[PDB]
Amino acid sequence: DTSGRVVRVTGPVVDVEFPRGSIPELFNALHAEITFESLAKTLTLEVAQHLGDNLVRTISLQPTDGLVRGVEVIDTGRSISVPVGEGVKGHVFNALGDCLDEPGYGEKFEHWSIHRKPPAFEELEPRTEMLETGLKVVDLLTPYVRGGKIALFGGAGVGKTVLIQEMINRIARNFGGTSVFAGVGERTREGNDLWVELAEANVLKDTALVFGQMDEPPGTRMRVALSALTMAEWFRDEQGQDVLLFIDNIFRFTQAGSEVSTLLGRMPSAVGYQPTLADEMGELQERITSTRGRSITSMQAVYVPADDYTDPAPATTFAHLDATTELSRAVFSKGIFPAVDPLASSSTILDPSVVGDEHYRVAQEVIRILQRYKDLQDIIAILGIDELSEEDKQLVNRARRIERFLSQNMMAAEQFTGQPGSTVPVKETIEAFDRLCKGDFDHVPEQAFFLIGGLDDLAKKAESLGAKL
Amino acid sequence: SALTMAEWFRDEQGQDVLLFIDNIFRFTQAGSEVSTLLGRMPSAVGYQPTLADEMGELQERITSTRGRSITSMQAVYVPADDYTDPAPATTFAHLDATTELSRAVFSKGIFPAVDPLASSST
Amino acid sequence: SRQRAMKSATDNADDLIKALTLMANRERQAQITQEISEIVGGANALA
Amino acid sequence: TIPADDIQSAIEEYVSSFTADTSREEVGTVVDAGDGIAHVEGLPSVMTQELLEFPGGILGVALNLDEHSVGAVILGDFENIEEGQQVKRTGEVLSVPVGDGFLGRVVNPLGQPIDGRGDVDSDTRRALELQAPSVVHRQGVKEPLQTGIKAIDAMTPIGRGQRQLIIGDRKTGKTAVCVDTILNQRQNWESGDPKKQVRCVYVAIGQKGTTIAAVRRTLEEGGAMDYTTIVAAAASESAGFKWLAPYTGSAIAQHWMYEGKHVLIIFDDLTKQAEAYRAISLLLRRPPGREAYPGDVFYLHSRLLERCAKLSDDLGGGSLTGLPIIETKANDISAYIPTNVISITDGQCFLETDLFNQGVRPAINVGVSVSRVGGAAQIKAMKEVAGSLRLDLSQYRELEAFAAFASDLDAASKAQLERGARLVELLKQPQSQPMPVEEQVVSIFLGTGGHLDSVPVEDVRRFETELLDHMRASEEEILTEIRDSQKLTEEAADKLTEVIKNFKKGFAATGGGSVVP
Amino acid sequence: YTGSAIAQHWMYEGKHVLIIFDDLTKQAEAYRAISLLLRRPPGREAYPGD
């Protein structure tokens, strides 16, 4: 009757012919069954182009191996819809909304289309607001933006998963919010590891995981971020909850878009990215924002091709990023957690008109001292601390103290140690680092600064080693 | 044609052939002069898509079997002195010994202009 | 004087490395774009 | 001794058992054919990736389907295809025979032997595109897969179920690393324990046939063909074989992984497999992208490399470890296929030509090489003796500029310089000479404990060789209980120090001096 | 080709000729123009295959 039939199969690209008055809308999801017993499945096809003569060109989300010309294609009448609600917490999904750890779960939930518009112009916030996380280094040197975007530049063995757990904890406890993780181009080994680590830290109940993996066609890797963002938008708008979205290698979203553009026969652009690189990046990043009092904040891992920051993909991604947190192995080796590089990380709202005058002055003094210590570190390494000047040695001591006080006892560490995590206010952090820059703690041993909170914890840790204010 | 003569001397006469091929690259280059006229979409650097396949179906006949020796020696043109060019880069995998000549060694007046750090032998 | 001059030369070599790397990334992007233009030109000529 | 009537009665029972009853079959016709591609009108019921039978016993794969014809890739003997020939359906997608009969054989990317040693009896068949283990069907990578190379096992450890890309220019030692890894499983196979045995699959894509023969000879000289299968798509094979060879080698060794066995697979130069897929895709007129690649080449390699997994205990606990090989040009790891495979894998071993020419062999760049599994793929002894190795080597690399200014350096800095020189000499290793893990532990203990600070740099290799020889001959208890207990307790370390001191007072340096502290 | 034919007629009568092709690059570019105007598929730098 009103169902279509497959006409062409060229890899992941499938052309489908419908009756004259039954052509599906663009982005609609169509279903076609592969009946070969070894490869029997149900392909979902997203309408990509209207070719004319009742033909539509669609991108398949599953491998099309075993698909026959002429088979029935059913139009669902809607785009890809994911389950939304509180029930998605603690469960793993793919870009199609299928539960991975429990198949068939969430089929009776409300379903939301993943293609949505950003908030209207009159609903946007004209005022930038800082997100008070509770970590000293973040709140001081690279303050986050509420409803903003934070690039994350940490690899393996620098505590990136610990930082993700920490932010999940802090959004769930200090804001009453929820977390959505998007694994875009996720490795299945690392996805299983993330699942197990979140279940063992008891933060999975606060997080909804959406995995579009590497062994999948480009359409799923291109739509997984929209699926996770749709869940986050339901949590923000319908539940009234601050959300934290985690995008795995946002670059892989760009790369899957480029691959889909190549498969659809579109002429490439500069370097090669799809001609609509900026448009797709904007359509995604504009839905992450504050509206009606609630917000979605996003920590996104960014891959930079060839370390070239002028490459079109990082250049288009950085047009939407508000802060940068680079996790360093040199900081991780010194035992400082989180291993945030204070000199390499940054924020666009570390500005006297956003954070204030004293915040800015204290942060800039800290950065100056740390940069001078970085300059002296090589003279110390090759020659020795004994060769330095007197003011040089004094600054070295003060800078080691500031380095170690930038560390913190994180809430992701309560699973191992057993002692809770700190939430230091901005005022206390500003005052503590002002005093540290003056020199009020140059007699305290270094170890008294490792993994503590504010100034009370500093005093009680100092007097445990035999040192007063 | 020359390979067929050498293959007869190897497989029927059975005695110690020497095969010299001056610029086997030209073979490849010829295949790229007719590629688009044959209706083939071009590959990366303007070469035919069947570069490695034709080079393999030719280079695998230039060989010694068990008890039947063919010592082969080919000149390979490196286009624009670029050793990363697809044609020499896929010729590299068909060889037991490669003497690589550099124009940097040539310009210093050293002859034969062999690059000692880029050349190899199994 | 030698210490000061070597610090100056180190800063100069740093700035030169930075400028040369910018130029090299520009040439890399340009090479990829030009290669894609040639491939797509051939493919569109044959289509 | 010829089995004469064996042959006679064999073909006789075949010809008596030949009853090919005639049934219907849906057929098509070749309309055009060129360059390894054939288009076939008809066949309305053919599916994507279905095997087709062209006259003369020729096989093809239906890749492009449209309203006019089926574009198929010919798998061999393409020069026999003609316009007008009748093409038949097989009704099956590409599958391969699997089983333990493949250990010690060299096969096609179709399961057909090319070594001429007879037929291969197969357990069953396995489709080439069976999906990967789910995200909930897996397990953390916890068991080490010892390569026998000290640089890899100490710096970039590989675990059972992990994917460690081996990436380098050319003639940098990638095949040597992978063949040494294969040879290192000989003792595991000799143990007879299915928990320790590793079956190996070597996939040769687009290689000269004599190079595959040389690899097979190297594996036979070391007793490694008792547990190794070679899937060879030589350089003379079609682009379809070069495209299918890693999927054939991975379909085999998935039959083993799903039986609770542990497998190691090597895809030698996946770059050539990507080039073959690009040739097929350009001949099928699919839209090209960067470097003319089809646009689903990342999918081509990630679909293959995500089937290497560590299965959960409910699924048997088997594992498949992938060692894909990528050749770069001019050390350009930002090329398209290198970027893709670096993105896909769990770690990378980068091999440099300059490091090779300086004498550093294996030519691994320990600074940029990385394993994301890390210390979870090491035994405790190796995890303990190699923890102070990476920082030491980085300090040595930072201080290499001050080699001729030791008197102008801090005493600690000159100590770091000498220690780093010793450690760089310690990570060198001959070709085709893998070391068991207990001996690598003893060697890295020699290095990082300080027992080489008194040996000349140019004598470290000989000192380590002769000390390991001594301990293999005299003090077998240290190695034996390191291997059994997987750790180096304090009494074992004490006995090791004693043996090292006695050997030092016995050892004779090349400069005539004494290595006694 | 015109100059080379004029010269070859002399060469084939026992005479010695010297021909100078000033900027064969312009001749290659004119051939590229002709080939692109006949809509023959381009190669590198849009030059024809021949």
Ligand SMILES: Nc1ncnc2c1ncn2[C@@H]1O[C@H](COP(=O)(O)OP(=O)(O)OP(=O)(O)O)[C@@H](O)[C@H]1O
């Ligand atoms: N650890 C080593 N010590 C000494 N020599 C080595 C070592 N590894 C490799 N070689 C030598 O280097 C040469 C080339 O190595 P190999 O063939 O393994 O490199 P490859 O990566 O396979 O390069 P290609 O594929 O281009 O041949 C070989 O002849 C081998 O003898």
Ligand SMILES: [Mg+2]
């Ligand atoms: Mg090799």
